[PDB]
Point group: D2
Chain length 32, copies 4
């Protein structure tokens, strides 16, 4: 990867991780 692509992917990864974490918390919070 180019530096620029690396940087971009790093920022994408951080955002996706945050979203995934929000979904995971919501699922975990469910009374079954």
């Amino acid at each position: 990867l180019s530096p620029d692509a690396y940087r971009f992917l790093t920022e994408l990864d951080r955002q996706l991780r945050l979203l995934q974490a929000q979904i995971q918390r919501l699922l975990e919070a469910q009374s079954l």
Copy 2:
């Protein structure tokens, strides 16, 4: 959450986890 919403979010979560993992592997694979 409704069952339907729970199910939907579960499947979304699984897909996002797979994508995040692909990005993480690509980043990790970079010679600095």
Copy 3:
């Protein structure tokens, strides 16, 4: 959907749309 689930999904959608747009712009910007 519950109001809460609707609200959550709305915010998720907005974030994903922003990410997708960033990727699309990067791809479009490529000299082939």
Copy 4:
């Protein structure tokens, strides 16, 4: 972008577009 990065991002984009579309359909399907 490298060819490899371009290819990767293309596939990521396709997957995200599919997910976003699923969320959008669910939201649109809601009786208010």
